[PDB]
Amino acid sequence: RIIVVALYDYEAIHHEDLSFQKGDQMVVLEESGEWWKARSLATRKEGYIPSNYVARLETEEWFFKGISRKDAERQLLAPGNMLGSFMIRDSETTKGSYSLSVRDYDPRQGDTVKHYKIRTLDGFYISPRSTFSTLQELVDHYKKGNDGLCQKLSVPCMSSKPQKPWEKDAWEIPRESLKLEKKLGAGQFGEVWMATYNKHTKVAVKTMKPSVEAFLAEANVMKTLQHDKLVKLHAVVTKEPIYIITEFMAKGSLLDFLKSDEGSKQPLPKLIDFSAQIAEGMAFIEQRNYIHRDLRAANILVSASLVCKIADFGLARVIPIKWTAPEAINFGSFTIKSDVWSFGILLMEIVTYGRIPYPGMSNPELERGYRMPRPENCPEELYNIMMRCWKNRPEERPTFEYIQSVLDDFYTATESQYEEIP
Ligand SMILES: Fc1ccc(-c2nc3n(c2-c2ccncc2)CCS3)cc1
Numbered sequence: 001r002i003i004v005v006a007l008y009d010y011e012a013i014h015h016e017d018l019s020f021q022k023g024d025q026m027v028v029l030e031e032s033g034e035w036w037k038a039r040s041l042a043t044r045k046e047g048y049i050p051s052n053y054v055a056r057l058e059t060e061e062w063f064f065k066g067i068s069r070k071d072a073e074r075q076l077l078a079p080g081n082m083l084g085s086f087m088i089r090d091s092e093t094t095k096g097s098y099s100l101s102v103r104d105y106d107p108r109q110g111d112t113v114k115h116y117k118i119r120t121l122d123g124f125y126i127s128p129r130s131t132f133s134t135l136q137e138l139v140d141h142y143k144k145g146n147d148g149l150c151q152k153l154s155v156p157c158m159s160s161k162p163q164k165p166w167e168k169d170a171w172e173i174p175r176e177s178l179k180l181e182k183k184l185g186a187g188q189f190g191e192v193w194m195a196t197y198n199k200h201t202k203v204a205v206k207t208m209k210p211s212v213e214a215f216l217a218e219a220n221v222m223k224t225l226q227h228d229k230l231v232k233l234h235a236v237v238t239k240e241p242i243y244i245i246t247e248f249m250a251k252g253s254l255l256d257f258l259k260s261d262e263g264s265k266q267p268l269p270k271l272i273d274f275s276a277q278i279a280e281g282m283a284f285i286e287q288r289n290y291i292h293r294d295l296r297a298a299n300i301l302v303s304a305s306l307v308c309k310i311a312d313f314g315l316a317r318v319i320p321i322k323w324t325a326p327e328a329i330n331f332g333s334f335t336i337k338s339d340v341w342s343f344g345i346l347l348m349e350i351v352t353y354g355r356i357p358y359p360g361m362s363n364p365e366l367e368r369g370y371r372m373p374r375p376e377n378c379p380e381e382l383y384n385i386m387m388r389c390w391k392n393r394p395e396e397r398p399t400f401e402y403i404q405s406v407l408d409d410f411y412t413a414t415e416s417q418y419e420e421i422p
């Protein structure tokens with residue numbers, strides 16, 4: 001007898017899925033991954049529901065599960081929030097513990113987010129003097145007054161409806177299910193379309209010009225590489241020409257967005273954030289021991305809410321020298337370090353708002369030790385990161401883990417990560 005509650009509103013759009021509202025209790029009948037079979041207690045109907053839409057602490061309006069410090073910082077500084085906006089989350093360095101992230105303001109620094117460790121007793125407390133038995137007592141307390149905090153607690157961080165999962169057992173789909181509506185891009189190997197799946201789910205389809213099974217297997221490799229900074233691979237059409245179905249990114253490629261009007265209005269910390277998300281994705285690729293082979297702003301997608309994701313890596317294997325490292329050009333040796341070089345070039349693209357890497361220079365001719373000069377708006381240390389990425393010896397290039405760690409806390413000293421309260 002398992003009972004869960006709905007965290008968000010969900011309207012059914014399939015044959016056997018259920019419609020429920022925020023707060024509706026339900027009885028779990030079967031747990032089958034992204035989709036569970038359950039029975040509503042309000043409608044008494046048995047059907048399918050998305051797992052990530054229900055919980056059995058998560059039910060609290062001020063708790064956010066599985067999110068990092070940087071993620072909290074991003075979601076709190078997002079539009080729709082104010083001073084005092086806060087959240088309680090799973091600690092990222094203290095496994096099993098919790099942390100509080102609060103939005104603050106201060107001149108000369110702008111809008112910020114402070115983070116406080118929450119210590120579990122052997123109850124909870126931020127300050128040893130003021131202790132609480134439940135987290136709800138903590139939040140209720142600090143909503144009354146700072147009491148040591150950077151700011152008085154106000155309203156929980158604005159919750160965002162999660163991504164609707166792909167329908168069950170729909171990895172291989174019939175072509176008739178798709179209506180390719182608007183061509184977004186074309187190339188030598190195929191084209192890219194904005195399309196609709198079964199009249200309900202907007203997706204992006206990549207049509208591949210005409211081995212079948214081997215490519216299919218490569219796609220089966222890609223499908224298991226799921227990450228928030230990697231484009232979600234939903235479905236595939238098997239009959240030629242092969243269609244690759246992925247999630248739709250509203251603002252398209254990072255290149256086009258940076259060259260766009262809205263992109264030119266994006267400040268430097270936002271660019272740093274973009275490249276930090278890209279670095280995180282490439283770090284996920286790095287930990288899994290894989291290779292992108294073609295890292296550029298053109299191969300990075302941007303969601304509607306300004307989220308940068310890595311797209312279509314590994315497709316290159318089934319087949320850009322300015323983004324390519326010397327060790328990969330002269331000897332065809334492609335490794336993660338060449339991806340680091342490529343990431344340096346990408347960094348340069350992002351700071352220069354999509355500008356061509358070596359302007360005025362043709363592909364031929366680096367041997368004289370020439371590196372791109374630092375742009376006027378580019379920070380010296382960021383340029384230092386670029387230079388570290390552009391090193392002749394591949395083994396002397398930084399890891400994507402380290403690069404991500406540096407870019408994430410680019411404006412924060414290590415000591416200033418979590419505020420200390422006596
Ligand atoms: F399977 C895939 C389908 C489309 C793409 C794709 N390739 C490019 N863009 C998109 C894309 C566009 C819009 N939404 C999502 C992806 C934009 C510039 S080049 C990649 C993989």
Ligand SMILES: [Ca+2]
Binds near residue numbers: 379380381
């Ligand atoms: Ca500086």
Ligand SMILES: [Ca+2]
Binds near residue numbers: 415418
């Ligand atoms: Ca500290």
Ligand SMILES: [Cl-]
Binds near residue numbers: 027039
């Ligand atoms: Cl029942």
